[PDB]
Amino acid sequence: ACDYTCGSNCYSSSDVSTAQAAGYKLHEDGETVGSNSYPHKYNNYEGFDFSVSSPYYEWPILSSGDVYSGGSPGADRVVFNENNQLAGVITHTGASGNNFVECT
Numbered sequence: 001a002c003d004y005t006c007g008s009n010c011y012s013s014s015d016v017s018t019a020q021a022a023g024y025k026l027h028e029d030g031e032t033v034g035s036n037s038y039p040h041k042y043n044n045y046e047g048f049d050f051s052v053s054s055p056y057y058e059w060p061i062l063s064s065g066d067v068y069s070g071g072s073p074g075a076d077r078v079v080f081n082e083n084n085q086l087a088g089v090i091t092h093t094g095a096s097g098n099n100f101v102e103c104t
């Protein structure tokens with residue numbers, strides 16, 4: 001069973017922890033990857049009820065199982081905070097335009 005289901009993509013907790021660790025490391029070092037500069041601030045315009053405090057940062061999680069290193073980020077993202085706490089896993093899949101919905 002999937003711990004997080006983003007559309008058709010299936011992710012386990014280990015998939016999320018691995019992606020999160022990479023994104024947080026880049027955040028700490030003040031570095032970014034890709035043309036859209038990840039990781040970067042996630043403003044939460046959607047208004048999700050996150051259990052952890054802001055600021056939030058978004059980082060791509062890939063269905064391939066690889067850690068994001070540039071190029072197309074796909075539709076899925078892990079959102080973490082300043083303390084490297086997982087806020088949640090969100091996706092563009094099933095959401096209009098560039099909006100997000102939570103992965104179930």
Ligand SMILES: Nc1nc2c(ncn2[C@@H]2O[C@H](CO)[C@@H](OP(=O)(O)O)[C@H]2O)c(=O)[nH]1
Nearest residue numbers: 036037041042043044045046058098099100
């Ligand atoms: N939908 C949405 N996009 C946000 C939010 N905060 C920042 N963004 C950025 O706005 C764009 C929406 O897809 C993305 O930028 P990016 O294109 O540079 O990755 C996304 O990272 C937010 O709260 N909601």
Ligand SMILES: [Ca+2]
Nearest residue numbers: 011012015065
């Ligand atoms: Ca996996």
